Design a protein around this nucleic acid. Structure first.
Lengths: 208, 129, 150, 84, 82
RNA sequence: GGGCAAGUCUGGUCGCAGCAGCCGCGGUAAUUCCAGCUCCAAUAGCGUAUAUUAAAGUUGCUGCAGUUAAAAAGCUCGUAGUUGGAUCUUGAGGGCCCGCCCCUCGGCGCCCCCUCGAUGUGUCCCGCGGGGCCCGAAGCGUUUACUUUGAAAAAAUUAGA
RNA sequence: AAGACGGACCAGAGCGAAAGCAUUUGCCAAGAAUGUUUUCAUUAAUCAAGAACGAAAGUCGGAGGUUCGAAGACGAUCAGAUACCGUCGUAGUUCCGACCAUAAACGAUGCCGACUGGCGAUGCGGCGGCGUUAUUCCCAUGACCCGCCGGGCAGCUUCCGGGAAACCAAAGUCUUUGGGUUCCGGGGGGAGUAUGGUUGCAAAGCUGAAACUUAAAGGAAUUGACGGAAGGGCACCACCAGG
RNA sequence: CAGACACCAUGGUGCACCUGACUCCUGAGG
């Protein structure tokens, strides 16, 4: 677990969640995400349970920890909103970064113009990062992924409930992940939160 | 409607097990079903079960394990005089080192190893391994 | 499975586990037996008696007050309908279809339907004959079906 | 289902929404109730799915009206099962 | 796979699972475990000593795996906010 | 030549003669023919024809197929025929095993006779031997199929000492 | 006036055993689904014989023939047309009582039960809401929205599982082979022919061989070639404008 | 979518073909 009071959440997180529009979900009924759901908003739309979002995020974070090299976890986003997000994560945690197009075959193909060696994949939506998700299960790689109520759950080990499409939702979850892994093993230390704001993540946000 | 009850139960468990599902609702529930489940349970092939009581005919919820590979039914039942048991055992089991043929004998519903010791034959219910 | 109807659905109530219903006022044996006797005087079937007893009185079935059911009471008394209620109502439908068939000789549907109902009577009747609820020396007929319903 | 659940004491909202004979412990949810209703001056016991009307001496006619589902009732009423 | 009283036949002893109680065979794809780090608690900061769960081809292709891992992890402990 | 074990043979022929169960060769540079030579297989035996058996899950009891390859009756009712829901009770000994529970016999006993000890046509320990009646036991209550143990169950054959 | 016919509304929508079935209204009996602490208390599943129904044409006797129209006769078009195409028009279409008993009567998939997976519709019933609209003083109505539950026709997406594949939540739970029952097939042709029987007024319907012939008949997918099949381009060895 | 939409038949043949072992060997020296 860790030192323990702020790993049972705190108001600071609950404010960030609400702001980033995490809480709203899809309108498709569930059979694999159903457990996670707190309550259903009137006339469709599911309110995800922040308590569940926490525990899964921490279990994910913990799995990246106990590797003494953070490079062999590949952070993956093909979404525009999360290109900046993963780039900041890679600076911070020390992940090997994949922003924009994946380009098929880097965990496959003996003869190729690039090859990456991971041990764990972190995905932002496995219906946009579907190519890594399929490719990973041909070569025996576990995949964590940020899943909503209409994402595929096949070949995903650990799902993290969250909207995880667009806006600040993808950004915030990368920020909180980086903060979490640095707590256990980093230089934030002692299981207390980051001094970096989530705004360094998020999207580019069109510059005036 | 149902002209055998063993055949439905056995299938139900196997189909659950394929999924990884750890529950079934079998019915109509009979004395023979209970007896078959207990012998099966003892050897570790399935987990524990719980009989729910109704005035319809009863319903059993079996919590199963994947220590089983196949529970087949020999429907329609045949006589076994302990010199067709050998023929069955080579035919329909993968080795003689493991698996049980489960029969009903006048000395009780028993596995065929116990049958061999008693030298009491009867009617063959099914098998598992 | 149904070979007696082209249905697929259900046609029975769910029934409760318990031998006592409703357990807050189950009345007494006395009350409902009097009521049964008086209703059965008027020539009412067990079905009709069960319905009216259920809703108006605080009994549901009378199987939960005493181990007897409405038919059993009737049968032991010797005041009872002279054939089972279901068999009556089956015979009654086959009469009604037969009257409609007399009216219309181009109604192919009615001919088909009559056959089905008649077959249904025969299988039910066969069951009653074997278990001595009907005499084996009676048999269903156009002739006698009329006489029963009248 | 996520296809590995085992339920030995199932919640009474996923067993109470189902059809009457499809329940995992089968007893119907039907009950009796006492009806007070003001033009009747006696407390008439009525069946929730009465079918045919319940009527009483105290009322002219005002007690039930037939409906194929739950029996219709008129003005002030109460219900307590009691104990099914 | 033993023979006799406990003589070793066999080329190797395969991994098992506890999310469906089915062996991981023989060179199969989509078969990997999942080392979650322990944290020592109270003072924070990761201390060893991996908790490992074994995930088979079967569960993953039937899209079970997400829920399964939580059941396995919770039942033997330990994660904050349980 | 392939199936098929052993000729990318030599001469001769050239869709001719023949070969060829089947597939196919031969119409001019024939590894299938016709001879020679060499080699192969089985070996006092081998080839051939034919019936039948195996292979053949191509008759499918064990153990078939029927959307489209050969194959669900136009449809329903329905008798024979086949098949059929749930539900009844039997503690010690030794480190399981045994009898039990929610009158023809044996014999707990009662009465009889030669009587066995109080006694020597005969008792009050008892039916012990013959009896009757009648309990733990047992026909017990209403039948079985099944299965189990026996007998009855040709020699040769056959497995096999 | 006659005879015929009920568009658009009309849909992978309903009902009916199937064949089949759309103008209005009323009558007659019938069927399902649903709700149901009602009744009986095992009455059931499925099937030789036996029986009910059965589009179209044809056939028996009438009505009737508007419309359209197997045959016939005409005009074209074609090397050939007797066809398609135009015209004239017969039986027939329509209607009634009888025959007849077959259709690719196609979802090419026996019937009954159990079990195994996601999501959203829609006809219909019932139930629920500090939901909308609507009417009477508001209601109880009713149409609608959301949720829940049944039984319908289907769909969608899936290493759910099968299959030779096409496909297919059944064509799944089949070598790890076995729930119940029924029907039909055993290479292709000869052939639904021969022959005897049977039913029919007739036309026809049912049962149903052999000699001989022959190592392929067939299914599916793949790749080519080709199309007087559909979307395309490019060139004075093609056309255009012209020499 | 919302301008015009015609006759036309016939025709034959063979050989597509199947195994692994790097030297120009340097050649005055070697």
């Amino acid at each position: 677990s860790g030192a323990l009071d702020v790993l049972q959440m705190k108001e600071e997180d609950v404010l960030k969640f609400l702001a980033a529009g995490t809480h709203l979900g899809g309108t498709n009924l569930d059979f694999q995400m159903e457990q996670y759901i707190y309550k259903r908003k009137s006339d469709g739309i599911y309110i995800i349970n922040l308590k569940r979002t926490w525990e899964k995020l921490l279990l994910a974070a913990r799995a990246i920890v106990a590797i003494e090299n953070p490079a062999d976890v590949s952070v993956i986003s093909s979404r525009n909103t999360g290109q900046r997000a993963v780039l900041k994560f890679a600076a911070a945690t020390g992940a090997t970064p994949i922003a924009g197009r994946f380009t098929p075959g880097t965990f496959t193909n003996q003869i190729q113009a690039a090859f990456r060696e991971p041990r764990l994949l972190v995905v932002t939506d496995p219906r946009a990062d579907h190519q890594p998700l399929t490719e990973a299960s041909y070569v025996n790689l576990p995949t964590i992924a940020l899943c909503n109520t209409d994402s595929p759950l096949r070949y995903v080990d650990i799902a993290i409930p969250c909207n995880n499409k667009g806006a600040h939702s993808v950004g915030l979850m990368w920020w909180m992940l980086a903060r979490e892994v640095l707590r256990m093993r980093g230089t934030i230390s002692r299981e207390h939160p980051w001094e970096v704001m989530p705004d360094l993540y998020f999207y580019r946000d069109p510059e005036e | 409607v149902r002209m055998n009850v063993l055949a439905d139960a056995l299938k139900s468990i196997n189909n659950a097990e394929k999924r990884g599902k750890r529950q079934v609702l079998i019915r109509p529930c009979s004395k023979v079903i209970v007896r078959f489940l207990t012998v099966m349970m003892k050897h570790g092939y399935i987990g524990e079960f719980e009989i729910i009581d109704d005035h319809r005919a009863g319903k059993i919820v079996v919590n199963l394990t994947g220590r089983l590979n196949k529970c087949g039914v020999i429907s329609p039942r045949f006589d076994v005089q302990l010199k067709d048991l050998e023929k069955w055992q080579n035919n329909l089991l993968p080795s003689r080192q493991f698996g049980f043929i489960v029969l009903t004998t006048s000395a009780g519903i028993m596995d065929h190893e116990e049958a061999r010791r008693k030298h009491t034959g009867g009617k063959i219910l099914g098998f598992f391994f | 499975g149904r070979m007696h109807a082209p249905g697929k659905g259900l046609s029975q109530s769910a029934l409760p586990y318990r031998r006592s219903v409703p357990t807050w006022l189950k009345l007494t044996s006395d009350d409902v037996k009097e009521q049964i006797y008086k209703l059965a005087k008027k020539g009412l079937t067990p079905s009709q008696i069960g319905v009216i007893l259920r809703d108006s009185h605080g009994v549901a079935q009378v199987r939960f007050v005493t181990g007897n059911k409405i038919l059993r009471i009737l049968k032991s008394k010797g005041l009872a309908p002279d054939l089972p209620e279901d068999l009556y109502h089956l015979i009654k439908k086959a009469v009604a279809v037969r009257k409609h068939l007399e009216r219309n000789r181009k109604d192919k549907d009615a001919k088909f339907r009559l056959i089905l109902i008649e077959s249904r009577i025969h299988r039910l009747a066969r069951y009653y004959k074997t278990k001595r609820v009907l005499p084996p020396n009676w048999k269903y007929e156009s002739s006698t079906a009329s006489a029963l319903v009248a | 289902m996520p296809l590995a659940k085992d339920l030995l004491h199932p919640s009474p909202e996923e067993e109470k929404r189902k059809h009457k004979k499809k329940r995992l412990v089968q007893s119907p949810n039907s009950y009796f109730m006492d009806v007070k209703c003001p033009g009747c001056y006696k407390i008439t016991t009525v069946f929730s799915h009465a079918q045919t009307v319940v009527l009483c001496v105290g009322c002219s006619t005002v007690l039930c009206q037939p409906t194929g589902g739950k029996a219709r009732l008129t003005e002030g009423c109460s219900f307590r099962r009691k104990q099914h | 796979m033993q023979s006799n009283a406990g003589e070793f036949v066999d080329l190797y002893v395969p991994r098992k699972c506890s999310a469906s109680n089915r062996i991981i065979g023989a060179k199969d794809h989509a078969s990997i475990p999942m080392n979650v780090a322990e944290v020592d608690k109270v003072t924070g900061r990761f201390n060893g000593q991996s908790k490992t769960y074994a995930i088979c081809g079967a569960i993953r292709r039937m899209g079970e795996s997400d829920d399964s891992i939580l059941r396995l992890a919770k039942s033997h402990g330990i994660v904050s906010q349980n």
